[PDB]
Amino acid sequence: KVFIGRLPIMLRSKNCYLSEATESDLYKLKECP
Amino acid sequence: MIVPVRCFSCGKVVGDKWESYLNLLQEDELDEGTALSRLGLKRYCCRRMILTHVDLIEKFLRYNP
Amino acid sequence: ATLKYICAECSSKLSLSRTDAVRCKDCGHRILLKARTKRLVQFEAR
Amino acid sequence: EEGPQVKIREASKDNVDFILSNVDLAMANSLRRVMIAEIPTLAIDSVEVETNTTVLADEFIAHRLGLIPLQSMDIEQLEYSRDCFCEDHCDKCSVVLTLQAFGESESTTNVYSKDLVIVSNLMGRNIGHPIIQDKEGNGVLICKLRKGQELKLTCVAKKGIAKEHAKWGPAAAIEFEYDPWNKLKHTDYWYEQDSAKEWPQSKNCEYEDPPNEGDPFDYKAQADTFYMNVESVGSIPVDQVVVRGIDTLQKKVASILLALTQMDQD
């Protein structure tokens, strides 16, 4: 409901898109697998 | 990251023998050490050259533009 | 036939100048590289 | 004939196992080195990169293009840049190769040395030809590329030798041995119990008669016989890599006599 700042997320953690993504998925993201 | 044309130490051409060797693995199903002798690589110097190089390029290739 | 910048993904010769922001036609991905220079570059063969 | 003779053993298109007899060691080696570093050859020494999108960076490919062996049999009639009166190169001292590639194939396109193109006048002479020995016929894999990756070059090959760089040398290796049964005792074998067993034997023992205990130590014995084996890359037929050897070396030993002359007038 209300905004209260931003929490810098850690890579490959639950909130990182990468946790879910796969091999082929990544390269199209540019992040090295 | 692409095959090393020519052997460091020794000097002999070796840039072509990639696919040839790589094939003696998947298709003709063989064991390294022998594969090499067949490709003509006899002495360890110009031997280690192939047996080691890791073809990163293929990984590189897989990006985009 | 001449150019300037590029889509870091949909690589499509873009080009622009002052105050034209820094986006792309559709995909916004405000990255943009700059492509080579026509003038040939020369190299040492060793 | 007159002196130092030979008795070629095995011999193919790439090797020339042979036996040099009745020469001085100095001479054997002297030759050896000559073969390795000073035989004039041809190769790329200037890449004018017009366009490249590959993952290999410009100067990378560059280096590679140099290594890629090129034809050089008539070399002896293509002046070294530094001597040809043309401002920076001409058909009379250089060979030009072009290179173009495009990612048409929806699956990795290979750029091989066969894709090179000669665009300078050859003047009708075996030279500047990307040497191939690959079964299929596409030798030396220069580099790969994907989707719409391009690569427009332009090379210039020149003379040059393994002193100015190895990319020129034709040698690539050279066997050398002698006194397979240490008779001059040019060594002192290292052991744990018995040299003989622990220190392997050479295929080259046969061609020379074994020891014979009792016998005292032969001291007046020098060094006849050497079991070389000039291998080769291809830029030159294994023979020339051995002839031109004995040749170049010889020319040098002359330019000393020649200099000893231009120096007698004063």
XYZ file of C-alpha atoms in Angstrom:
410
model
C 0.000 0.000 0.000
C 2.764 2.487 0.899
C 6.264 3.253 -0.420
C 9.142 3.036 2.052
C 12.473 3.221 0.254
C 14.301 0.575 -1.782
C 16.197 -2.521 -0.683
C 19.338 -3.188 -2.726
C 18.948 -6.764 -3.857
C 21.701 -9.391 -4.019
C 22.484 -11.168 -7.276
C 21.219 -14.713 -7.776
C 19.029 -14.401 -4.654
C 15.259 -15.162 -4.651
C 14.449 -11.660 -5.945
C 17.019 -11.691 -8.719
C 15.541 -12.553 -12.094
C 18.584 -14.777 -12.616
C 17.593 -17.276 -9.903
C 14.711 -18.393 -12.088
C 16.310 -17.894 -15.535
C 18.179 -20.692 -17.340
C 21.255 -21.209 -19.550
C 19.950 -19.898 -22.872
C 17.858 -17.414 -20.882
C 20.939 -15.658 -19.489
C 23.047 -15.132 -22.599
C 20.125 -13.098 -24.019
C 20.456 -11.062 -20.816
C 24.201 -10.672 -21.309
C 24.985 -12.018 -17.846
C 27.527 -14.830 -18.100
C 25.963 -18.081 -16.936
C 38.978 -19.238 -27.368
C 39.842 -20.641 -30.806
C 42.531 -23.160 -31.464
C 46.151 -22.049 -31.272
C 47.517 -22.027 -34.813
C 50.992 -23.512 -34.537
C 52.653 -24.915 -31.443
C 54.337 -22.619 -28.957
C 57.416 -24.568 -28.021
C 58.058 -26.570 -31.246
C 56.398 -24.661 -33.989
C 54.344 -27.102 -36.030
C 51.022 -26.095 -37.608
C 48.091 -27.163 -35.470
C 45.223 -24.806 -36.201
C 43.382 -27.112 -38.601
C 43.535 -30.275 -36.543
C 40.813 -28.951 -34.222
C 37.646 -30.293 -35.804
C 39.543 -33.362 -37.027
C 40.467 -34.208 -33.430
C 37.186 -33.074 -31.921
C 35.532 -35.523 -34.348
C 37.747 -38.451 -33.420
C 35.881 -38.062 -30.141
C 32.146 -37.853 -30.789
C 31.978 -39.954 -33.970
C 34.860 -42.438 -34.270
C 34.609 -42.734 -30.456
C 38.245 -42.935 -29.352
C 40.478 -42.090 -26.418
C 42.527 -38.871 -26.414
C 46.118 -40.094 -26.251
C 45.563 -42.238 -29.333
C 43.475 -39.717 -31.256
C 46.460 -37.384 -31.107
C 49.027 -39.866 -32.439
C 46.640 -40.332 -35.400
C 46.386 -36.613 -36.057
C 50.188 -36.778 -36.180
C 50.922 -35.009 -32.916
C 53.757 -37.147 -31.545
C 55.854 -35.124 -29.070
C 54.249 -33.651 -25.931
C 55.171 -30.090 -26.795
C 53.026 -29.855 -29.877
C 50.796 -32.435 -28.118
C 49.764 -30.590 -24.966
C 48.749 -27.764 -27.278
C 45.489 -29.489 -28.314
C 44.780 -31.661 -25.282
C 44.429 -28.475 -23.256
C 43.047 -25.499 -25.177
C 39.519 -24.750 -24.024
C 37.430 -23.452 -26.955
C 35.724 -20.534 -25.110
C 34.939 -18.897 -28.425
C 31.918 -21.208 -28.690
C 30.686 -19.718 -25.443
C 31.569 -16.247 -26.720
C 29.686 -16.875 -29.934
C 26.530 -17.627 -28.032
C 25.893 -14.003 -27.030
C 24.315 -11.642 -29.598
C 25.697 -8.792 -31.814
C 25.236 4.498 -46.052
C 26.648 6.262 -42.951
C 25.545 5.882 -39.303
C 26.452 6.635 -35.680
C 25.157 4.619 -32.713
C 23.592 1.168 -32.168
C 20.915 -0.779 -30.194
C 22.921 -2.876 -27.762
C 20.472 -5.673 -28.667
C 18.330 -5.002 -31.729
C 21.480 -3.471 -33.280
C 19.873 -1.017 -35.647
C 21.842 1.922 -36.960
C 20.200 4.760 -35.086
C 22.011 8.122 -34.914
C 20.993 11.499 -33.482
C 22.273 14.645 -31.802
C 21.531 17.218 -29.079
C 18.409 17.007 -26.847
C 17.027 14.016 -28.795
C 17.234 12.101 -25.489
C 19.011 8.752 -25.900
C 16.453 6.103 -26.730
C 15.492 3.699 -29.440
C 12.575 3.143 -31.857
C 10.396 0.824 -29.693
C 12.718 -1.035 -27.252
C 13.963 1.818 -25.078
C 17.085 0.108 -23.691
C 18.950 3.398 -23.344
C 22.387 1.840 -23.881
C 23.662 2.486 -27.428
C 27.223 1.709 -28.529
C 28.899 3.753 -31.286
C 30.004 1.512 -34.154
C 33.402 1.570 -35.894
C 35.161 4.294 -37.899
C 35.310 4.119 -41.655
C 39.012 4.951 -41.902
C 40.800 1.597 -42.011
C 42.983 0.737 -39.038
C 46.312 -0.946 -39.681
C 48.017 -3.668 -37.660
C 51.287 -5.374 -36.900
C 51.271 -8.981 -38.143
C 53.234 -10.301 -35.176
C 81.949 -37.928 -53.409
C 84.642 -35.605 -51.891
C 83.740 -35.153 -48.228
C 80.717 -34.953 -45.826
C 78.226 -37.502 -47.139
C 74.626 -38.485 -46.402
C 72.467 -41.648 -46.269
C 68.821 -40.566 -46.099
C 66.779 -43.033 -44.065
C 62.961 -42.675 -44.041
C 61.616 -39.755 -46.070
C 58.208 -38.304 -46.835
C 56.608 -34.998 -47.787
C 56.891 -33.720 -44.233
C 59.996 -35.337 -42.751
C 63.446 -36.254 -43.969
C 65.048 -38.558 -41.454
C 68.649 -38.884 -42.565
C 72.251 -39.407 -41.612
C 74.963 -36.809 -41.901
C 78.388 -38.470 -41.901
C 81.938 -37.144 -41.849
C 81.467 -33.492 -40.786
C 82.449 -31.500 -37.704
C 79.877 -31.190 -34.934
C 80.029 -27.390 -35.196
C 78.903 -27.869 -38.795
C 76.013 -30.169 -38.000
C 74.539 -27.667 -35.581
C 75.618 -24.625 -37.535
C 73.355 -26.090 -40.168
C 70.585 -27.033 -37.772
C 70.252 -23.446 -36.522
C 70.391 -22.066 -40.066
C 67.439 -24.274 -40.976
C 65.539 -23.073 -37.936
C 66.010 -19.293 -38.074
C 67.351 -17.938 -41.335
C 65.571 -19.532 -44.278
C 63.714 -16.813 -46.194
C 60.017 -17.474 -46.368
C 56.800 -15.634 -46.949
C 53.936 -14.678 -44.625
C 51.411 -12.009 -43.710
C 52.965 -8.947 -42.016
C 50.301 -6.270 -42.393
C 46.571 -6.557 -41.836
C 44.375 -3.653 -42.830
C 41.177 -4.359 -40.905
C 38.203 -2.722 -42.640
C 35.373 -4.411 -40.746
C 35.095 -6.900 -37.900
C 32.314 -7.877 -35.508
C 33.763 -11.189 -34.268
C 34.565 -11.961 -30.643
C 38.278 -12.180 -31.463
C 39.671 -8.642 -31.284
C 41.359 -7.078 -34.295
C 45.033 -7.609 -33.346
C 44.092 -11.127 -32.265
C 43.046 -12.317 -35.681
C 45.949 -10.268 -36.944
C 48.487 -12.348 -35.032
C 46.836 -15.510 -36.255
C 46.922 -14.456 -39.926
C 50.677 -14.124 -39.533
C 51.141 -17.658 -38.230
C 49.060 -19.076 -41.096
C 51.734 -20.581 -43.388
C 51.892 -19.347 -46.945
C 53.470 -20.684 -50.122
C 57.095 -19.851 -50.571
C 58.979 -21.901 -53.114
C 59.960 -19.197 -55.499
C 60.542 -16.874 -52.540
C 64.058 -16.441 -53.917
C 62.684 -14.060 -56.560
C 60.430 -11.732 -54.578
C 62.541 -8.886 -53.196
C 62.365 -8.018 -49.489
C 60.305 -4.811 -49.040
C 63.302 -2.973 -47.655
C 65.050 -3.343 -50.981
C 62.370 -2.780 -53.590
C 62.437 0.843 -54.706
C 58.729 1.293 -54.273
C 57.406 3.585 -51.607
C 56.061 0.909 -49.113
C 55.513 -2.250 -51.409
C 54.623 -3.626 -54.761
C 53.854 -6.791 -56.695
C 57.653 -6.999 -56.999
C 58.153 -7.550 -53.280
C 54.748 -8.405 -51.822
C 51.604 -10.519 -51.916
C 48.136 -9.261 -51.080
C 45.379 -11.401 -49.597
C 41.824 -10.403 -48.844
C 39.366 -11.851 -46.425
C 35.601 -11.574 -46.279
C 33.065 -13.483 -44.202
C 29.416 -13.062 -43.204
C 27.088 -14.852 -40.816
C 24.611 -16.061 -43.403
C 24.299 -19.590 -41.996
C 21.895 -19.785 -39.071
C 24.592 -21.875 -37.392
C 28.199 -20.713 -36.904
C 30.287 -19.967 -40.021
C 33.942 -20.984 -40.033
C 36.670 -18.759 -41.383
C 39.487 -20.917 -42.690
C 42.769 -20.006 -44.332
C 41.290 -21.304 -47.589
C 39.007 -18.293 -47.610
C 41.987 -16.116 -48.424
C 42.148 -14.408 -51.776
C 45.177 -13.284 -53.742
C 44.620 -9.882 -55.335
C 48.126 -8.770 -56.238
C 49.818 -9.934 -59.434
C 51.624 -13.166 -58.793
C 53.803 -12.668 -61.854
C 53.428 -16.399 -62.379
C 55.385 -18.053 -59.544
C 54.556 -20.422 -56.690
C 54.036 -18.022 -53.793
C 51.550 -16.532 -51.372
C 49.347 -19.579 -51.437
C 47.785 -20.554 -48.124
C 49.322 -23.990 -47.735
C 46.846 -26.783 -47.021
C 47.410 -30.343 -45.758
C 44.055 -30.707 -44.068
C 42.189 -33.839 -45.215
C 38.978 -31.995 -46.234
C 40.723 -29.015 -47.814
C 40.144 -25.945 -45.646
C 43.194 -25.942 -43.312
C 43.844 -23.726 -40.256
C 40.699 -22.409 -38.591
C 41.096 -18.626 -38.387
C 37.980 -17.783 -36.414
C 34.232 -18.309 -36.039
C 31.186 -15.952 -35.970
C 27.389 -15.910 -35.438
C 24.297 -14.044 -36.733
C 25.338 -10.972 -38.702
C 29.006 -10.910 -37.740
C 31.288 -9.700 -40.526
C 35.028 -9.598 -41.112
C 36.702 -7.654 -43.978
C 40.501 -7.601 -43.935
C 43.353 -7.248 -46.388
C 46.814 -8.614 -45.803
C 50.222 -8.047 -47.275
C 52.789 -10.767 -47.015
C 56.499 -10.085 -47.237
C 59.764 -11.975 -46.971
C 61.237 -12.142 -43.465
C 62.890 -14.818 -41.347
C 62.779 -16.598 -38.003
C 65.166 -13.991 -36.667
C 62.712 -11.150 -37.280
C 60.038 -13.552 -35.972
C 59.197 -17.208 -35.942
C 55.988 -16.824 -37.994
C 58.478 -16.954 -40.866
C 60.678 -19.901 -39.994
C 59.827 -23.069 -41.936
C 61.559 -25.462 -39.516
C 58.987 -26.149 -36.729
C 61.319 -28.762 -35.100
C 64.440 -30.814 -35.896
C 65.717 -34.058 -34.396
C 69.418 -34.176 -33.546
C 71.644 -36.789 -31.875
C 74.947 -38.660 -31.970
C 77.165 -41.207 -30.172
C 73.939 -43.047 -29.077
C 76.184 -45.216 -26.881
C 78.119 -42.554 -24.982
C 81.574 -43.351 -26.368
C 83.102 -39.872 -26.121
C 81.508 -39.694 -22.689
C 79.862 -36.383 -23.553
C 77.676 -37.019 -20.557
C 77.632 -38.638 -17.138
C 74.415 -40.539 -16.706
C 72.495 -39.938 -13.507
C 71.239 -43.065 -11.767
C 70.044 -44.782 -8.595
C 71.587 -48.200 -9.280
C 72.529 -48.851 -12.942
C 72.629 -46.372 -15.824
C 72.163 -48.980 -18.560
C 68.696 -50.116 -17.437
C 67.245 -46.842 -16.051
C 68.337 -44.728 -19.021
C 66.400 -45.909 -22.154
C 67.997 -46.903 -25.432
C 67.631 -44.959 -28.688
C 66.354 -46.373 -31.953
C 69.602 -44.875 -33.243
C 71.853 -47.317 -31.366
C 71.588 -49.947 -34.052
C 73.184 -48.020 -36.897
C 76.358 -47.791 -34.773
C 78.299 -50.731 -33.257
C 77.831 -51.305 -29.471
C 80.537 -50.879 -26.724
C 82.734 -53.941 -25.973
C 83.751 -53.670 -22.290
C 87.418 -54.629 -21.929
C 88.440 -51.946 -24.432
C 90.226 -48.912 -22.937
C 88.737 -45.425 -23.294
C 89.027 -44.095 -26.834
C 90.313 -40.553 -26.505
C 91.336 -39.618 -30.046
C 87.668 -40.134 -30.953
C 85.881 -37.036 -32.286
C 82.372 -36.826 -33.772
C 81.422 -38.415 -37.107
C 77.746 -39.181 -37.691
C 74.582 -37.314 -36.721
C 71.001 -38.568 -36.911
C 68.960 -35.531 -37.847
C 65.411 -35.337 -39.184
C 64.265 -32.052 -40.612
C 60.505 -31.873 -40.149
C 58.489 -29.145 -41.847
C 55.504 -26.895 -41.917
C 54.918 -26.860 -45.626
C 55.940 -23.377 -46.758
C 58.784 -25.348 -48.234
C 59.226 -28.974 -49.239
C 61.192 -30.752 -46.490
C 64.130 -30.994 -48.912
C 64.710 -27.277 -49.509
C 64.292 -26.747 -45.779
C 67.514 -28.742 -45.822
C 69.094 -27.618 -49.063
C 68.441 -23.911 -48.793
C 69.763 -24.559 -45.343
C 73.158 -25.774 -46.538
C 72.781 -22.958 -49.051
C 71.994 -19.878 -46.995
C 74.616 -20.880 -44.444
C 77.083 -21.125 -47.321
C 76.229 -17.649 -48.704
C 76.950 -16.127 -45.317
C 80.369 -17.752 -45.020
C 80.942 -16.006 -48.337
C 79.885 -12.495 -47.423
C 82.745 -12.681 -44.971
C 85.213 -13.441 -47.749
C 83.449 -10.766 -49.810
C 83.823 -8.294 -46.973
C 87.400 -9.383 -46.417
C 87.852 -8.144 -49.977
C 86.107 -4.758 -50.076
C 88.519 -4.201 -47.187
C 91.817 -5.122 -48.888
C 91.743 -2.079 -51.206
C 92.513 0.075 -48.156
